[PDB]
Amino acid sequence: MIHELLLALSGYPGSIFTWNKRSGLQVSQDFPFLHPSETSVLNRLCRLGTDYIRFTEFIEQYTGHVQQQQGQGGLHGIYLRAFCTGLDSVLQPYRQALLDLEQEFLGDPHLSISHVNYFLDQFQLLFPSVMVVVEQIKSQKIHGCQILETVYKHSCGGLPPVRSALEKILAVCHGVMYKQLSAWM
Amino acid sequence: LVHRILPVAASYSAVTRFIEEKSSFEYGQVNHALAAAMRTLVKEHLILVSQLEQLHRQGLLSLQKLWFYIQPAMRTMDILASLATSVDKGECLGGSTLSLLHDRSFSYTGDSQAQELCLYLTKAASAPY
Amino acid sequence: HVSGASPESISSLLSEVAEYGTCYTRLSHFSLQPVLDSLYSKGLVFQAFTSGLRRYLQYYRACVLSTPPTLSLLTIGFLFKKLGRQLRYLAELCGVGAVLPGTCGGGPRAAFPTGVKLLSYLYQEALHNCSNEHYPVLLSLLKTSCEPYTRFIHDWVYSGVFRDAYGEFMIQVNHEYLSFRDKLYWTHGYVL
């Protein structure tokens, strides 16, 4: 149950954590050995994971997938690629944290799940938020620079961590705009 | 991994046979100079294997370290062993092996790891002509 | 089925690294094959491309060796992820690496551009990924790749010497020039 969860959160599923495209990650919900109390916590922990997998799939889907081969801002574009380059670097601390937990588990052979909940619970809030930034991009087929504004309106976020988190991405995306403006001018 | 490190041996026994056979008075003044400056690269190859032995003596060398260590001299031998096949294959002697050294030097024009070796073999082999 | 401490996801995680490895082998192969001193199919410029690619492959190999022998299982993958994609991209850039992706057979065997076309195929791909993290790798390949043309230019510039093997250089010469007359001097030309 312990190393197994880190494997799942890291983004590779296992029988105890059944990936369903509709259900993201889902516990079997029935193991006589484990009482119902720990189940809910796992589900809660799974949510962070459900988002980790979706993000990677999307980043993989539009980033480096082709050597620039009806490509359009929703489908593709130098800006769309820039959003992906940033999304993975903003998610980097989550990777470092998961890595660190293992070192402690290597350090001690009996650490409760609650201990896991405490260390990963700062990400429990940043990940859901970043989700809408992307979700708006896909539905509205936001094209080209219009993406630069879509994040900026969510730059007024009421969570200080999220604000810093998204701000990093705009800095990355501006780089390209500054890059294209670097020529026509 | 032994097989992938073994081509520098086939490019060492073939290279050495050419330095014995084409050093006789019969093969002509230039074929003698080409092998007499090819024998200097064999002395330096032996100097490398002596250093690798000392590292091996101190338990501080492995087949993954050896593989990286010999890569630079796997190339030098490959250029010397192919050039020797060709100078021998066409029965070239006199100036027919002073053109084959000018043309091969052009073949690699961008490399600079192998270009310096060839440009050197022609400075050495053209001294008698 | 039975395994010594191997839940399936470990195999799935092992499979992702493997993807990276397959590329290395195939790529190490694509560049490794040297010119052989008789590469009629490829041009002088194709032989320059491969040489440069190996220099990258050698640097890639060195990073793999540098890895601490002692490291956590999951930690090793998270460490190489950036490189893992970087190379798969490098692989697709060339048809071979793109080919045998694993999602298809080796039958497509896509033709790689050669000569000026290759030099151009690259430049266009340069502009397409210019803002992306993978862009520095391309600039390097290109700088070296461009060297032969410059020499050709120098030889047909400061000098008038006309020199080529596979005729990948656009300018072309005919035997009408050997007529050595004004009408045949024009009849001898250059490609468009």
Curated annotation (Swiss-Prot), chain A:
Compartments (UniProt record): Cytoplasm, Cytoskeleton, Microtubule organizing center, Centrosome
Membrane-traversing stretches: none
Subunit structure: Component of the gamma-tubulin ring complex (gTuRC) consisting of TUBGCP2, TUBGCP3, TUBGCP4, TUBGCP5 and TUBGCP6 and gamma-tubulin TUBG1 or TUBG2. TUBGCP2, TUBGCP3, TUBGCP4, TUBGCP5 and TUBGCP6 assemble in a 5:5:2:1:1 stoichiometry; each is associated with a gamma-tubulin, thereby arranging 14 gamma-tubulins in a helical manner. Gamma-tubulin at the first position is blocked by TUBGCP3 at the last position, allowing 13 protafilaments to grow into a microtubule.
Similarity remark: Belongs to the TUBGCP family.
Clinical disorder: Microcephaly and chorioretinopathy, autosomal recessive, 3: A disorder characterized by congenital microcephaly and chorioretinal dysplasia associated with poor vision and nystagmus. Variable ocular anomalies include microphthalmia, retinal folding, retinal detachment, optic nerve hypoplasia, absence of retinal vessels, round areas of chorioretinal atrophy, and attenuated electroretinogram. Most patients have mild developmental delay and mild learning difficulties.
Protein function: Component of the gamma-tubulin ring complex (gTuRC) which mediates microtubule nucleation. The gTuRC regulates the minus-end nucleation of alpha-beta tubulin heterodimers that grow into microtubule protafilaments, a critical step in centrosome duplication and spindle formation.
Annotated protein name in UniProt: Gamma-tubulin complex component 4
Lineage: Eukaryota, Metazoa, Chordata, Craniata, Vertebrata
Curated annotation (Swiss-Prot), chain B:
Outcome of mutating R75C: In CDCBM15; uncertain significance
Ranges in a coiled coil: none
Tissue specificity comment: Ubiquitously expressed.
Location(s) in or outside the cell: Cytoplasm, Cytoskeleton, Microtubule organizing center, Centrosome
Function: Component of the gamma-tubulin ring complex (gTuRC) which mediates microtubule nucleation. The gTuRC regulates the minus-end nucleation of alpha-beta tubulin heterodimers that grow into microtubule protafilaments, a critical step in centrosome duplication and spindle formation. Plays a role in neuronal migration.
UniProt similarity note: Belongs to the TUBGCP family.
Record text on subunit structure and interactions: Component of the gamma-tubulin ring complex (gTuRC) consisting of TUBGCP2, TUBGCP3, TUBGCP4, TUBGCP5 and TUBGCP6 and gamma-tubulin TUBG1 or TUBG2. TUBGCP2, TUBGCP3, TUBGCP4, TUBGCP5 and TUBGCP6 assemble in a 5:5:2:1:1 stoichiometry; each is associated with a gamma-tubulin, thereby arranging 14 gamma-tubulins in a helical manner. Gamma-tubulin at the first position is blocked by TUBGCP3 at the last position, allowing 13 protafilaments to grow into a microtubule.
Disorder noted: Cortical dysplasia, complex, with other brain malformations 15: An autosomal recessive disorder characterized by global developmental delay, variably impaired intellectual development, speech delay, facial dysmorphism, microcephaly, and varying degrees of cortical malformations including pachygyria, thin corpus callosum and subcortical band heterotopia. Most patients have generalized seizures.
Protein name: Gamma-tubulin complex component 2
Residues of the full protein shown: 259 to 387 of 902
Curated annotation (Swiss-Prot), chain C:
Coiled-coil ranges (or none): none
Linked pathology: Microcephaly and chorioretinopathy, autosomal recessive, 1: A syndrome characterized by microcephaly, cognitive impairment, underdeveloped retina and choroid, and epilepsy in some patients. The more anterior parts of the retina, near the periphery and pars plana, have a grayish hue and diminutive vasculature similar to retinopathy of prematurity. Visual impairment becomes evident during the first year of life.
Domain of life: Eukaryota
Subunit (UniProt): Component of the gamma-tubulin ring complex (gTuRC) consisting of TUBGCP2, TUBGCP3, TUBGCP4, TUBGCP5 and TUBGCP6 and gamma-tubulin TUBG1 or TUBG2. TUBGCP2, TUBGCP3, TUBGCP4, TUBGCP5 and TUBGCP6 assemble in a 5:5:2:1:1 stoichiometry; each is associated with a gamma-tubulin, thereby arranging 14 gamma-tubulins in a helical manner. Gamma-tubulin at the first position is blocked by TUBGCP3 at the last position, allowing 13 protafilaments to grow into a microtubule.
Section of the entire sequence shown: 384 to 575 of 1819
Family per similarity comment: Belongs to the TUBGCP family.
Protein role: Component of the gamma-tubulin ring complex (gTuRC) which mediates microtubule nucleation. The gTuRC regulates the minus-end nucleation of alpha-beta tubulin heterodimers that grow into microtubule protafilaments, a critical step in centrosome duplication and spindle formation.
Subcellular location: Cytoplasm, Cytoskeleton, Microtubule organizing center, Centrosome
Protein name, per record: Gamma-tubulin complex component 6
